[PDB]
Symmetry: C2
Subunit: 66 residues, 2 copies
């Protein structure tokens, strides 16, 4: 039952490694959440550019039709 | 040293739980990677709409200036 002890120490090692993995995987999640946010800000700016250009096309069409 | 045994079983329980957490955190990562992809496809379609509207404004400006 040094091998009870040995299996114990094997399991601790494994716990340590899994705990580092969980810690890292929760870092990757946090930064995916902020890049998604950033990409969504890019969508919103583009929607804003489309609507400005639609306004400019409408203005030109009023003139064009006089 | 039933308590060697008892601490062993405590550690297995913990390993099981951490292994489920890692499994789930790697599910959340996979689906963040695909939502980011999807959001990026939305950006690309919008860039395409902007450029179509810029082409239409240019066409109108040529006419307007005749
Ligand atoms: N728009
Ligand atoms: N453009």
């Amino acid at each position: 039952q040094e091998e009870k002890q040995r299996k114990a120490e094997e399991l601790l090692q494994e716990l340590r490694h899994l705990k580092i993995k969980v810690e890292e995987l929760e870092n990757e999640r946090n930064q995916y959440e902020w890049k998604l946010k950033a990409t969504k800000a890019e969508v919103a700016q583009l929607q804003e550019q489309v609507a400005l250009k639609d306004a400019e096309i409408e203005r030109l069409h009023s003139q064009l039709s006089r």
